[PDB]
Amino acid sequence: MHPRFQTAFAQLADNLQSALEPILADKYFPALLTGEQVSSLKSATGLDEDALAFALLPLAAACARTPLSNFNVGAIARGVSGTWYFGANMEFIGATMQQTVHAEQSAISHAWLSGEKALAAITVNYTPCGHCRQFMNELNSGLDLRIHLPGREAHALRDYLPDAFGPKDLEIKTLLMDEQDHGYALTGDALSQAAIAAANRSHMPYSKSPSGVALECKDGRIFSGSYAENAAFNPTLPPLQGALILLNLKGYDYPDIQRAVLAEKADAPLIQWDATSATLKALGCHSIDRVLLA
Amino acid sequence: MHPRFQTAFAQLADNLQSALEPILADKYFPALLTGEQVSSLKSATGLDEDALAFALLPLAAACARTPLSNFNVGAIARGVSGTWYFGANMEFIGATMQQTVHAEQSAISHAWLSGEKALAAITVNYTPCGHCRQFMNELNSGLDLRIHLPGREAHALRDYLPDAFGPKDLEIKTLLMDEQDHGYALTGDALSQAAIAAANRSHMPYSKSPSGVALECKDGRIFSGSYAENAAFNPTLPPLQGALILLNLKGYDYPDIQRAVLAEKADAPLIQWDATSATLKALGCHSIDRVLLA
Numbered sequence: 001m002h003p004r005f006q007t008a009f010a011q012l013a014d015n016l017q018s019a020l021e022p023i024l025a026d027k028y029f030p031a032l033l034t035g036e037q038v039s040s041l042k043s044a045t046g047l048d049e050d051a052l053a054f055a056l057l058p059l060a061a062a063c064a065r066t067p068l069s070n071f072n073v074g075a076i077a078r079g080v081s082g083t084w085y086f087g088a089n090m091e092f093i094g095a096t097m098q099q100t101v102h103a104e105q106s107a108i109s110h111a112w113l114s115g116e117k118a119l120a121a122i123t124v125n126y127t128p129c130g131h132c133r134q135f136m137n138e139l140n141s142g143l144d145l146r147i148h149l150p151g152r153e154a155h156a157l158r159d160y161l162p163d164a165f166g167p168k169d170l171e172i173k174t175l176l177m178d179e180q181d182h183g184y185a186l187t188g189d190a191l192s193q194a195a196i197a198a199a200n201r202s203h204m205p206y207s208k209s210p211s212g213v214a215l216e217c218k219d220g221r222i223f224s225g226s227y228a229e230n231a232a233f234n235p236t237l238p239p240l241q242g243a244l245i246l247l248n249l250k251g252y253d254y255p256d257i258q259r260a261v262l263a264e265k266a267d268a269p270l271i272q273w274d275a276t277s278a279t280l281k282a283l284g285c286h287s288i289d290r291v292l293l294a
Numbered sequence: 295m296h297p298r299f300q301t302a303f304a305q306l307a308d309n310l311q312s313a314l315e316p317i318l319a320d321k322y323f324p325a326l327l328t329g330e331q332v333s334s335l336k337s338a339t340g341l342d343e344d345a346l347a348f349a350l351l352p353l354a355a356a357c358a359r360t361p362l363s364n365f366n367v368g369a370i371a372r373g374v375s376g377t378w379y380f381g382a383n384m385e386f387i388g389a390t391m392q393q394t395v396h397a398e399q400s401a402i403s404h405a406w407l408s409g410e411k412a413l414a415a416i417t418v419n420y421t422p423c424g425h426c427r428q429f430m431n432e433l434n435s436g437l438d439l440r441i442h443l444p445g446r447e448a449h450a451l452r453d454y455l456p457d458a459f460g461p462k463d464l465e466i467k468t469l470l471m472d473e474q475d476h477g478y479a480l481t482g483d484a485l486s487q488a489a490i491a492a493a494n495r496s497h498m499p500y501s502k503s504p505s506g507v508a509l510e511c512k513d514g515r516i517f518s519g520s521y522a523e524n525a526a527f528n529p530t531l532p533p534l535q536g537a538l539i540l541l542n543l544k545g546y547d548y549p550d551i552q553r554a555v556l557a558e559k560a561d562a563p564l565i566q567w568d569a570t571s572a573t574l575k576a577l578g579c580h581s582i583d584r585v586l587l588a
């Protein structure tokens with residue numbers, strides 16, 4: 001089992017531990033659970049979903065990277081698929097606060113990127129900051145998203161975000177997790193195509209600047225991120241971050257990053273380039289290439 | 295009167311117009327009103343503060359810069375001083391969504407930077423996004439801040455941000471607008487010192503990386519911004535933005551920017567440098583210098 005889970009795992013309940021140990025066994029346990037696993041989990045313990053999710057939090061939080069805060073936050077997004085995706089915050093020393101990733105964004109994009117069509121609920125070990133409540137309201141699940149916090153009843157997003165601002169305010173009709181395909185031709189090597197492919201699924205109704213980032217690991221593994229705009233602009237999820245979320249959740253570490261490509265239009269109104277390299281360099285990867293969309 | 299106000303002004307009520315015209319007369323009307331002016335305003339019209347603020351919105355919104363959205367948002371922060379500060383959103387073509395400024399952040403930092411000790415209320419022509427509700431909760435006014443929106447009753451922040459996350463969650467005791475002075479020696483030319491001075495008032499309890507940006511205009515005017523962290527990290531106000539807010543509100547335009555300096559520690563965990571130049575270049579200023587704090 002991935003050491004990141006060591007401690008957490010140890011404070012889990014005996015029957016839960018047993019049910020889990022087989023799954024967590026793999027270092028490369030993908031920080032996710034299929035329906036089937038959930039069911040199994042539910043039988044070995046007498047937990048109901050909600051209780052199960054709360055019970056897994058600490059594992060989701062085990063994946064956090066917080067050199068600054070030291071404030072571990074885990075989240076679990078529940079697919080309409082039955083799959084549960086873990087999420088955890090990340091802070092990058094050498095960059096800016098604007099580069100940070102919240103547990104919630106982590107889980108939701110984990111899910112989105114993985115192909116999930118919609119979420120039903122999300123569970124966090126801490127009340128969501130306003131930045132995340134706003135991030136949440138961009139999804140096709142709307143104000144209905146259900147949110148579970150420890151020691152609280154469940155509530156819909158609408159309750160956490162009264163009189164909310166969202167895509168409708170801007171006359172935006174396509175929501176995050178809705179089906180998208182911008183249609184750019186994939187070209188170049190693998191990495192280039194992984195980037196372009198991500199740019200293709202990007203959510204960018206406000207600025208109309210598609211973008212994607214793909215990261216190649218030592219072992220030739222390839223994690224890629226899609227750009228995700230937000231109505232309030234600022235909470236937008238830059239493409240780099242997408243990739244790093246996957247990369248981390250999945251058991252990898254920065255240093256395993258071999259090379260990275262970024263794809264975008266040259267003439268787009270918004271430009272990912274600088275923030276991408278910068279942060280990437282901050283992480284120690286100077287191998288950045290960019291590919292121009294068309 | 296600054297053309298930016300032309301249209302707005304024209305749809306104001308006759309008695310309000312009259313009361314205003316003398317003030318708005320100056321191109322360099324500083325997008326702000328002293329107590330005295332407010333009083334005068336109140337007498338010429340029979341308005342009460344709240345109604346007065348709602349009535350001035352469109353002027354606050356006249357100051358917006360929205361090449362992307364085209365979504366003008368104005369805000370008015372009311373000092374405990376009796377001074378009212380205007381605010382408006384800004385979007386920068388060529389940068390990223392994370393560089394955007396919300397009307398609310400604009401007003402609050404307008405006030406903060408101007409020396410305001412605390413706010414009593416804020417009025418916006420649109421419901422605040424979650425990013426701003428979060429930004430608001432960093433102030434020393436806490437959940438008590440009062441918020442006025444058109445067609446709604448007033449409410450405290452707590453109402454817009456139920457079960458909120460904030461500085462206390464991180465054990466942070468110094469709030470934004472509280473009195474701060476990091477104690478760096480001012481040095482170099484004017485610009486350098488303006489930068490350092492700003493770095494000195496910066497709010498950075500989470501990362502501990504002070505920073506400041508000062509901009510010199512053609513005419514030798516100098517606008518400077520202070521760094522403002524936020525508990526949720528992301529909503530943090532980078533130092534550059536500070537300066538540009540003032541610069542815009544005050545009647546200036548990008549192209550009047552002559553040179554700019556940024557001050558920060560070299561070894562800080564967070565680094566403003568890249569985002570600063572980048573955006574600055576995006577705006578057409580390549581004249582960036584950095585000064586190392588100590």
Ligand SMILES: O=C1N[C@H](O)C=CN1[C@@H]1O[C@H](CO)[C@@H](O)[C@H]1O
Pocket residue numbers: 066069071073088089090091100101102103104126127128129130132133459525526527
């Ligand atoms: O991850 C979350 N989610 C919740 O909305 C609130 C806060 N945090 C975060 O937890 C840390 C403290 O702000 C940061 O890494 C920031 O991303």
Ligand SMILES: O=C1N[C@H](O)C=CN1[C@@H]1O[C@H](CO)[C@@H](O)[C@H]1O
Pocket residue numbers: 165231232233360363365367382383384385394395396397398420421422423424426427
């Ligand atoms: O300025 C605000 N304040 C409110 O919290 C909500 C939205 N906007 C903004 O208005 C525009 C649309 O998102 C952007 O410039 C963004 O900064």
Ligand SMILES: [Zn+2]
Pocket residue numbers: 102103104128129130131132133526
């Ligand atoms: Zn958050």
Ligand SMILES: [Zn+2]
Pocket residue numbers: 232396397398422423424425426427
């Ligand atoms: Zn806002």
